[PDB]
Design a protein around this ligand. Structure first.
Ligand SMILES: CNc1cc(N2CCN(C)CC2)nc(N)n1
Length: 154
């Protein structure tokens, strides 16, 4: 049994948009925008919804760039995260209750203030390669196992 989640990265030629998570799961870390996929919406619609709720942004087209599965030791549910990317966004990003948005130069990505797994798969994102990842966590800071591979179809 797994649960569907979304993650959205706004990636422009010289900069990537991140949000500082202000509360809840992963608070204190920069991340793409996203959340639970609801009953009654597609994964992509959920990704769009969460981008809007967390940054105020809307987008023309979302592209599937990755899938990452997470196991947390002791938790029955696997987290099945669908990672999306876009270059063209609509609007200017604004702070929400969940997220404080900020643009980062591509050589200044704040990996030490991101989920540890990002250090592994974020380069593949930047290199415009599609990927499948799996990460086993003990708590929120320690990766016990992982796999990472490029794919042709996400
Ligand atoms: C557990 N490792 C994670 C989780 C994570 N999450 C959890 C699920 N989504 C809401 C998006 C944010 N994002 C990254 N970059 N790494």
């Amino acid at each position: 049994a797994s649960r569907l989640y979304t993650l959205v990265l706004v990636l422009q030629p010289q900069r990537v948009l991140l949000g500082m998570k202000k509360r809840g799961f992963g608070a204190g870390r920069w991340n793409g925008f996203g959340g639970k996929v609801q009953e009654g919406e597609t994964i992509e619609d959920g990704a769009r919804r969460e981008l809007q709720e967390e940054s105020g942004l809307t987008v023309d087209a979302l592209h599937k760039v990755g899938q990452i599965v997470f196991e947390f030791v002791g938790e029955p549910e696997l987290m099945d995260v669908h990672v999306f990317c876009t270059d063209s966004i609509q609007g200017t990003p604004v702070e929400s209750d969940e997220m404080r948005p900020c643009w980062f130069q591509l050589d200044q990505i704040p990996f030490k203030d991101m989920w540890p797994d990002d250090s592994y798969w974020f380069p593949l994102l930047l290199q415009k390669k599609k990927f499948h990842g799996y990460f086993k966590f003990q708590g929120q800071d320690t990766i016990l196992d992982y796999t990472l591979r490029e794919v042709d179809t996400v």
